[PDB]
Predict the structure.
Amino acid sequence: DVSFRLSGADPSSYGMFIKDLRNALPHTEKVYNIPLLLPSVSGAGRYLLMHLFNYDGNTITVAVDVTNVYIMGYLALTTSYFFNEPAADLASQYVFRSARRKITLPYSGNYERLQIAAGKPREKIPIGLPALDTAISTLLHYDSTAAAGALLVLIQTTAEAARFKYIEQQIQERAYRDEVPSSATISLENSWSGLSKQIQLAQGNNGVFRTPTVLVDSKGNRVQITNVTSNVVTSNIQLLLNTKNI
Ligand SMILES: CC(=O)N[C@@H](CCCNC(=N)N)C(=O)O
Ligand SMILES: *[C@@H]1O[C@H](CO)[C@@H](O)[C@H](O)[C@H]1NC(C)=O
């Protein structure tokens, strides 16, 4: 399991949590020195539990699929909640089985469904450590509209920061002031599957992408990624979705 406490949180303690989250995900190989997530994991071992504590010390446990860093559901006191999708209903067979009741949320976990439920795109939702504290708080008591926004904050400040060093640093910059994500952040989230596949196809192709990946940069400038020498590959990306899952 891994844990993160908002009470006393700072850039350093958040970076330690994101390092523990990355290190909790199993891999048997690295591709261009980046851990390659597993094709598959059977049974309960598929799910990592992340224990998150709001500033007041209240807690939710979040279940994360270790092959793709997708959040499946979470437990808040005696109630479990899962996305309305087959992968999450499968997870509910393995995790939080001791909850007194299980609520299926009225959306799946992908960004488009969640933004629809929340009533706003994530370009307009501030993220940061204070937003994460609010999110854990929201999740403690069911409210499906409020929870959609909370889950957009939670996915970006946990999974997306584990996947990209750039996003982890964006959150660290927001340790004590929220701010909506940079266009570069949104670009990277949206590109993780694309990138993961092209970095894997590059082995066998002399480090060269079969298909270029188009990204927005730190300056709001639109750029093209064609090979593994790009900073996005050498420095930023931290985990690769296995092509078997693409
Ligand atoms: C879209 C995204 O990355 N999402 C979340 C998890 C969402 C789980 N559900 C589906 N993917 N359908 C994450 O934790 O990363
Ligand atoms: C590889 O990527 C780098 C950095 O983005 C770029 O400068 C270069 O032109 C690319 N090389 C090839 C052979 O495409």
Summary: Residues 78 and 99 are 5 Å apart (CA to CA).
